[PDB]
């Protein structure tokens, strides 16, 4: 197993961890702010997924400073992970294309 592939799998396991920790900490950060909606865990994990993939419908989002900081970590972890996979697919294609030559 090549490095690019390992970094990818590793990025995916880390993403799943950031999603679960993100869901937990967003609820922790948001309860206490009047009007906040990101306050029960099942919808926070869903919020965490749509943030990490950058879709951002939104239907829910953080209103406090710490929930937002948590949002930024989720965003960056998702963008980095999906980017790592893209780059791993590139390394794979470039390697196999040099063999077809």
């Amino acid at each position: 197993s090549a490095l690019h592939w390992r970094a990818a799998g590793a990025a995916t396991v880390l993403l799943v961890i950031v999603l679960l920790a993100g869901s937990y900490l967003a609820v922790l950060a948001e309860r206490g702010a009047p009007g906040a909606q990101l306050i029960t865990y099942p919808r926070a994990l869903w919020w965490a997924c749509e943030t990490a993939t950058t879709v951002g419908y939104x239907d829910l989002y953080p209103v406090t400073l710490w929930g937002r900081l948590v949002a930024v970590v989720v965003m960056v972890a998702g963008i980095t992970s999906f980017g790592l996979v893209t780059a791993a697919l590139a390394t794979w294609f470039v390697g196999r294309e040099q063999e077809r030559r």
């Epitope: 609820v27 009047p34 906040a36 909606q37 029960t40 865990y41």
Partner: antibody
């Protein structure tokens, strides 16, 4: 078995303070919150505050005057509510309730009847 | 904070009849409404969660409906054991809040 155990009563003199307890059993998770609800005789349910034991953070009802301070004890699985500088207005049944972080109160304590009298 | 209005405060019905308690939220809360029963001297008891979901251990006679700002708790063929106070509670926005309560009364 009873999931939340609370003392049946507490007598407190005006100006004094008391600390109510809520001992929990059954399944316990990192996502549990313990809530406290106040009910005066003949009246409705009034939310006081909440605490997430696994982390120790508490939030309180801003619409009312703060008489409560919540704390939890991980080892003894007990949540505590310290009421301070009480008056007759503070006499009521205080229930603790458990929420699995999904918004509803699955189970309630039997409640502690508090009386503020000389 | 979300204000939950329960009206009427007292509801009188005849045995076996169908009854409906109403809960109106001051703003839209999807289906994040929960219903509780509290008999005289008893502690509250969860009856319906998320507006219409059944709870194990609760007679099938009980059902909930609504979404948005208007919610209903219904009882098919009310009986004596249903005499109590009923509360709705919302979990859509912080802080959680309760409705003021409806009392069920039976005319025998």
């Amino acid at each position: 078995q009873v999931q939340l155990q609370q003392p049946g009563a507490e007598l407190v003199k005006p100006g004094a303070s008391v600390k109510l307890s809520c001992k929990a059993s059954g399944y316990t998770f990192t996502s549990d919150w313990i809530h406290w609800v106040k009910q005066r005789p003949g009246h409705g349910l009034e939310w006081i505050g909440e605490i997430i034991p696994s982390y120790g953070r508490a939030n309180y009802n801003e619409k009312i005057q703060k008489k409560a301070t919540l704390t939890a004890d991980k080892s003894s699985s007990t949540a505590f509510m310290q009421l301070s500088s009480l008056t007759s207005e503070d006499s009521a049944v205080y229930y603790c309730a458990r929420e699995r972080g999904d918004g509803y109160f699955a189970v309630w304590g039997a409640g502690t009847t508090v009386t503020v009298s000389s | 904070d979300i204000l939950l209005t329960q009206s009427p405060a007292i509801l009188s019905v005849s045995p076996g009849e169908r009854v409906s308690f109403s809960c109106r939220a001051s703003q839209s809360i999807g289906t994040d409404i929960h219903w509780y029963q509290q008999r005289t001297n008893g502690s509250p008891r969860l009856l319906i969660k998320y507006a219409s979901e059944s709870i194990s251990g609760i007679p099938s006679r009980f059902s909930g409906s609504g979404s948005g700002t208007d919610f209903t708790l219904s009882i098919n063929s009310v009986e004596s054991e249903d005499i109590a106070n009923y509360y709705c509670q919302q979990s859509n926005r912080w802080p959680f809040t309760f409705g003021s309560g409806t009392k069920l009364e039976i005319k025998r």
